[PDB]
Amino acid sequence: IIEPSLKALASKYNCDKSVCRKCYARLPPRATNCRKRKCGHTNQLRPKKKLK
Amino acid sequence: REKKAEYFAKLREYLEEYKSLFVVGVDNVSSQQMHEVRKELRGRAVVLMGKNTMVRRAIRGFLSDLPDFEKLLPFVKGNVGFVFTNEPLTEIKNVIVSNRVAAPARAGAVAPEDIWVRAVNTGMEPGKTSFFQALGVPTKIARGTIEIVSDVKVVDAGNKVGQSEASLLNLLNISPFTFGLTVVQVYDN
Amino acid sequence: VAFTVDQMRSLMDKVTNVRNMSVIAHVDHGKSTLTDSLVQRAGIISAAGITIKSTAISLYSEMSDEDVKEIKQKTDGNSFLINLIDSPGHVDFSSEVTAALRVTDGALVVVDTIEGVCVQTETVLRQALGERIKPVVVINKVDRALLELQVSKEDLYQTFARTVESVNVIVSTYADEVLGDVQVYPARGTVAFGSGLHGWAFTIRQFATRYAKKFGVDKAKMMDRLWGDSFFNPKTKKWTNKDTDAEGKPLERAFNMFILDPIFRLFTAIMNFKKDEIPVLLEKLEIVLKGDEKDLEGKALLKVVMRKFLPAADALLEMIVLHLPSPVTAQAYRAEQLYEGPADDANCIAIKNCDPKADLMLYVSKMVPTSDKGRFYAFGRVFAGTVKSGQKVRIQGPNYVPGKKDDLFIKAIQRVVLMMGRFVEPIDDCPAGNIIGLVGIDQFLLKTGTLTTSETAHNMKVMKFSVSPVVQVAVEVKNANDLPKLVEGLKRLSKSDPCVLTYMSESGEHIVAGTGELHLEICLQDLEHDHAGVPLKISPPVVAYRETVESESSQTALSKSPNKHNRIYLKAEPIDEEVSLAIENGIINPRDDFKARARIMADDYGWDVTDARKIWCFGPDGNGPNLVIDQTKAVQYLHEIKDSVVAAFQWATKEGPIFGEEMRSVRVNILDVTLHADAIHRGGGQIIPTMRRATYAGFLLADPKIQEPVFLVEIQCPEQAVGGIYSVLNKKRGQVVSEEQRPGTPLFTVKAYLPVNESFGFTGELRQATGGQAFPQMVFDHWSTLGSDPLDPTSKAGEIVLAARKRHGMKEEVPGWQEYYDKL
Amino acid sequence: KGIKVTVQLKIQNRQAAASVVPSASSLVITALKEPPRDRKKDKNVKHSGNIQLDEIIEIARQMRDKSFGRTLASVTKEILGTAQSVGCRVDFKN
RNA sequence: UUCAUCUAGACAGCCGGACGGUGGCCAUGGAAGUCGGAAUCCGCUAAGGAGUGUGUAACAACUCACCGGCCGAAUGAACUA
Ligand SMILES: CO[C@H]1[C@@H](O)[C@H](O)[C@H](OC[C@@]23C[C@@H]4[C@H](C)CC[C@H]4[C@@]4(C=O)C[C@@H]2C[C@H](C(C)C)[C@@]34C(=O)O)O[C@@H]1C
Ligand SMILES: Nc1nc2c(ncn2[C@@H]2O[C@H](COP(=O)(O)OP(=O)(O)O)[C@@H](O)[C@H]2O)c(=O)[nH]1
């Protein structure tokens, strides 16, 4: 059981993110830079790898 | 700014020559459908859309080629373009209010009215059965072809269309999310 | 309720009252343990999820002649014997599934409401319909769809409406139109509901009965108005076929209020230990409890209440007699594709007009095991005849044709036995259309085979399976001496399993092939302690390719006698595929006439009659694809040394120079023949390590590689599953040959090419790619040429080659033609 | 007639076997050409063409789905040339 | 420290088009704007790239550029320390 608007909203707060390539942390997909200072606030990021 | 200045001189050319015109508005339309319109009258009704370079067409209304420009500036707002002609309007008005049909259920578009459809064998082999499974609509096999069992009123008026049900409504020849392409203002001489 | 052998034998005699089907479904839907409760409530008695080696539970129940007005067949009995043979759903163990279909007329399907209609359930449903068998939609585990999920009437009916239309799609596509309209409709009273682990099960028809006049009209018309677009108005007191009132408010569908509602209220009440409401409804259903029955509360509370409400074997056997088939109606147009060749033949007609007293016909698909005197019994179904304890009848082997003799053994059975659950007991007779177990034919038959009295009978349909052996493995012993026992054990595994294909290889190993790796390790397990009885030695099947040259050996290699006298110069050229292929084909034979063999090679596969007519060898063993020709003509001792030449030729062309394998499509050319005076110095005693050492150096200067074995893997599988296949073959150099499909059935039969060294677990990755939907039937095709040059350990086969020499315990890597060469 | 990438419309009426060819851009570049551009290149990649053709390729544009919605002679000067790298007609289209 | 277009009507923003040839030259077991090389065109207007990506086995579908609504003055891009 999933359904369009339902499996879509679920992903919006779990898969629809951007995995930082230095600290991995979750940022808005439509991001540009990290909000953590352990990485020196890097810009190198990559959207959270999809399912195949 | 290069092409902004040349657009002025060009649209200016057709307005300075012809007798009567149409400042036609249209939000919902399709590119491919749009050029079929200009081809609907490749001569008597040549279309020409506009924007803020049309806010200057009112400052070209300040240029005033003829005093009749008063009855034109109060129609600049919305996706409104042009329609140039020199033949009787009732005849060509017939064509523009005959140049109006539209698009289907673009997964997640506006759902304003009631979604009701009858129950008779669709006429195609059992294909999108996995969708009506997680969807739950009464439909049984009648000579291989999937047959509508219930007069399913799918989605209720006023919401956001779901990806799954819109695609099967496409197979049902359901096109009600747009209906565009008319006039915004009527003007002559 | 059975009494005795003869009493149970007398019910059998009536084939009109013989519901012979099988139970298939999927890995964990509750079919094996649910069939356990049906027998514990209506099985058999005469005067006394992995399906781990199953048999066929018989069983028999009671009905009425009034139930008989609804069955469209020629039945006149009321006592019915239903023989259900267990058949494991799965897919990596679907061996016994194809066997059951053929040796039965009907079949039951255990679908689910929660897990629903799975991928394998969909394709296993196809095997039964592609065989012309009838349906039984049993949506079980309904207690967890209302206990550990708990839905609404209209809404749960939609999980069931899904179960309906899902099993329904396999029907209208993966079935046969000769059966008529074999599309199971819940309302038509062809769909089963229930809970197997808690002994209760009801049917659509079951409540149409406990309602008919308690409604006002016939129960037939009413139960068809119970499912679908049908609503009752608790105000107008009428039946309106609309889901709202004269105002526009919600209605609880006719189904939801009459069947569902009661169950719904009973459900909760019993599951909520509220005996303050239990008796009230317990009364509306005429249910009584006494003593230690009411000592069980909540879960166990509903367990015994609903049993006494919805009867196990009863409800499913209600639609099994008035719907599920027997030989009478089934074989009527089942026998068409139950036999090949003459369908208008009188022996196949015996099966159409089921005559136990005519052309004796029977097909043993299984071989139920019990190690005594011989080894075990056979298991077949009689299609036209009565069997006896010592009857003399013929055997149509998988080869045998009515006009020949091979695979035809006509012997008399020592004794007959009828299957009761898992064990049997000594019977003496069984007529046309009934499944029996004939023993004493073990030490004769070669697995699945026919058994007919009439010798003019053609040949039946030899299984089907739709799987084929594709899991490859090799064996040995941890202890050298117990080696012989392990080998006679593969013979035993032959006679202990169906799809298991044990064979020998070009490695000196006993190969094992099967349905799955689980399957394999399962046969391996049942073997390791039983069939074998000793520590084996399993590992991926050792592969041997072929050491072949191609770029025409440029320089002439020099190899003279060990005294240094008789020198011969050879050049290694490539023999065309269509050419070397014909040697192994039986076209260009090593015992054929040269003038006509030269006309053949010159015109059809182009060459100059000179070297064509002057051929000498067919290495190795004079049947392989290695041909030697004499480029000379002025040799004083031509064929006076031809023998010593052909001799060392095969020995060397068999045990290879690169590492140690025979060669393929290589033409050795004896450019120059330089011999000595006296013939004594001109004997094989020199010509052997001369011609051998000649091809040795000639081989390592002919620029050779390895033409290895390629598979013609036929991956017949679903359409949207095709996505996964492309990517999987896109990896293992899968060279997809063709790709055609039947417009209607989404199943796309696809053939391709796959490297032998690229398939040690290949099947596994396919099913993981798109669910157990893909189907790999790897049938080895030909030898596809590579390109890496292994004389340097960077080449793909180069690593393989040195480790093969390292394997055999040889001279390390590849020793240069200079180490074994002759000159200044 | 036509090979590489198939765009053939087929309409059916229960047993009614009838087809209507849409003649893609592939079909026109080989339709006017002679035999070595019709066959003989099974084991060969098609990459040559320049020589002048003319106006009759305007009616060949009527074979390539007329849903472009504009002028005929005008759009011919586009399709054939930039996406059509064989039989360029006038070396002015790129 | 440098170039745009720039209230005339901006960019960030939300609102409507993402086209024909075209399932383009080939290339394909398969490739249709998105495995791929080579071409990078004009019919039309407000505009649409043989096309920015996702995803189809490929179709389809969504989306970006381009361009129409409104928000309505800057404020975007490129670099130094
Ligand atoms: C009907 O079942 C068939 C198919 O599964 C397929 O044709 C399979 O092929 C087996 C092999 C056949 C190859 C040719 C005939 C020449 C080389 C042979 C092999 C040796 O390496 C390659 C494949 C895999 C086997 C190696 C592992 C020893 C072969 C063999 O039988 O020796 O054979 C079985 C019996
Ligand atoms: N929740 C629930 N589980 C069930 C029910 N019936 C059987 N099972 C489970 O099914 C399992 C056995 O499945 P099996 O009979 O092996 O499935 P099969 O191989 O498809 O026939 C057991 O471990 C039970 O826990 C039921 O009615 N409800």
Ligand SMILES: [Mg+2]
């Ligand atoms: Mg089981």
